[PDB]
């Protein structure tokens, strides 16, 4: 029963581990979300501007 309890404790550990691992995936994913958005915004401003620059 203590080994059953040992399974239970490792289970709660792994459950909160799954919480935080989903969180790590989400942290990189939202880091990626902001990267594509802001990097896209920067390259787009830069691109239409350089278009404007050389064509001007």
């Amino acid at each position: 029963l203590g080994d059953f309890m040992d399974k239970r404790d490792a289970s709660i550990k792994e459950q909160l581990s799954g919480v935080k691992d989903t969180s790590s995936e989400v942290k990189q994913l939202e880091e990626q979300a902001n990267a594509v958005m802001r990097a896209a915004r920067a390259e787009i401003s830069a691109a239409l501007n350089k278009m404007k620059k050389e064509t001007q």
Binding site: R8, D9, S11, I12
Partner: peptide, 28 residues
Amino acid sequence: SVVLGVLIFFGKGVLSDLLDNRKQRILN
């Protein structure tokens, strides 16, 4: 005697209450 009656009552209260908090932690 019934010292142990009232005592087993409140003491298993504290004991199983603490273990109730332990399994409650396993849940929460």
